[PDB]
Design a protein around this ligand. Structure first.
Ligand code: S91
Length: 329
């Protein structure tokens, strides 16, 4: 049951709440709708409150926006919530598992990813779950970052934690520091993902397909090779450092080897993005200004945010209030 009033008609399943494609009789165009009703499960409401707030605040060409939201007129009657967004032709995930991207395509995709990330980060926000399935693409290959479900506000000061700390974000694109002593409250956590995403656009397959928590880590050290003495020193947590030391030595696999068909500049940037020590990992602005993206880099055309961005009763009430602007009057 997809009850989205009269304005939106001609429904049809799209993916998995439930996402469908409807025609906007008011905009003479088609759009996508996402049905959400996790209210029962508190462990699924704050994620809806976060994204809505972050997505309405954000305004960027490379970031998906909310064109409209649907819900009951009263908090009592409000059950399901319908978020409406622009309908894209596909995503990086489906494209990677069927198409071969040319160097020019990779360059453009990388640029659009970083351009929007720059805005996200400029608003002191971390995406934390960037990956192909979260990058929508239209027929002309324009890219848009989506799903700020796990996004948070940067909090570098309180990013340290013990060894083997549970993490939600997709395993394959998790930064090595996450399985060691990082809680994921630093902007470098997003650059690492963009990194993994680059490698994937090069060989059409995830770079570090870990099978489990540690498998992700041992899969990373496989290419980068054992972390240097300096990088380890940075790590203070005894449990974490001793694990890296217990591990056998691993040589570094040369990028020009994993992707001999890649572009040297791109590989040079891939190197900066996939750095074991987060503190030395390149920044988004430094990535946009990298020689690889030289034909696109334009700081004046790369907007930044204008300013830095619960019981089972408040979340519903809060979400209800955050969705009022889309109600008549
Ligand atoms: C499958 C799925 C899962 C989660 C969200 C969407 N939603 C969206 N889907 C599209 N087009 C879209 C339609 C189909 C696919 C996969 C395929 O090739 O069949 C990928 C993207 N465009 C925008 C959104 C959006 N704004 O949410 C689609």
């Amino acid at each position: 049951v997809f009850d989205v009033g009269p304005r939106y008609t001609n429904l049809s399943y799209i993916g998995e709440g439930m996402v469908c494609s409807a025609y906007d009789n008011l905009n003479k165009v088609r759009v996508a709708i996402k049905k959400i009703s996790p209210f029962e499960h508190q462990t699924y409401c704050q994620r809806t409150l976060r994204e809505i707030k972050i997505l309405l605040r954000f305004r960027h060409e490379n970031i998906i926006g909310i064109n409209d939201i649907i819900r009951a007129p009263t908090i009592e009657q409000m059950k399901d919530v319908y978020i409406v967004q622009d309908l894209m032709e596909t995503d990086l995930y489906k494209l990677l598992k069927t198409q071969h991207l040319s160097n020019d395509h990779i360059c453009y995709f990388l640029y659009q990813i970083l351009r929007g990330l720059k805005y996200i980060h400029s608003a002191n926000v971390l995406h934390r779950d960037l990956k192909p399935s979260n990058l929508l693409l239209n027929t002309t290959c324009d890219l848009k970052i989506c799903d700020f479900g796990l996004a948070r506000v940067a909090d570098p000061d309180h990013d340290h934690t013990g060894f083997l700390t549970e993490y939600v974000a997709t395993r394959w694109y998790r930064a090595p520091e996450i399985m060691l002593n990082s809680k994921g409250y630093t902007k470098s956590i997003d650059i690492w993902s963009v990194g993994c995403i680059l490698a994937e656009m090069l060989s059409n397959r995830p770079i570090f397909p870990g099978k489990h928590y540690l498998d992700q880590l041992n899969h990373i050290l496989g290419i980068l090779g054992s972390p240097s003495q300096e990088d380890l020193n940075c790590i203070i947590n005894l449990k974490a450092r001793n694990y890296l030391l217990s591990l056998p030595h691993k040589n570094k696999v040369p990028w020009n080897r994993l992707f001999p068909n890649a572009d040297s500049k791109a590989l040079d940037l891939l190197d900066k993005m996939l750095t074991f020590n987060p503190h030395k990992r390149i920044e988004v602005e430094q990535a946009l200004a990298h020689p690889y993206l030289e034909q696109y880099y334009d700081p004046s055309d790369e907007p930044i945010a204008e300013a830095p961005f619960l019981p089972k009763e408040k979340l519903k009430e809060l979400i209800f209030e955050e969705t009022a602007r889309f109600q008549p009057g």
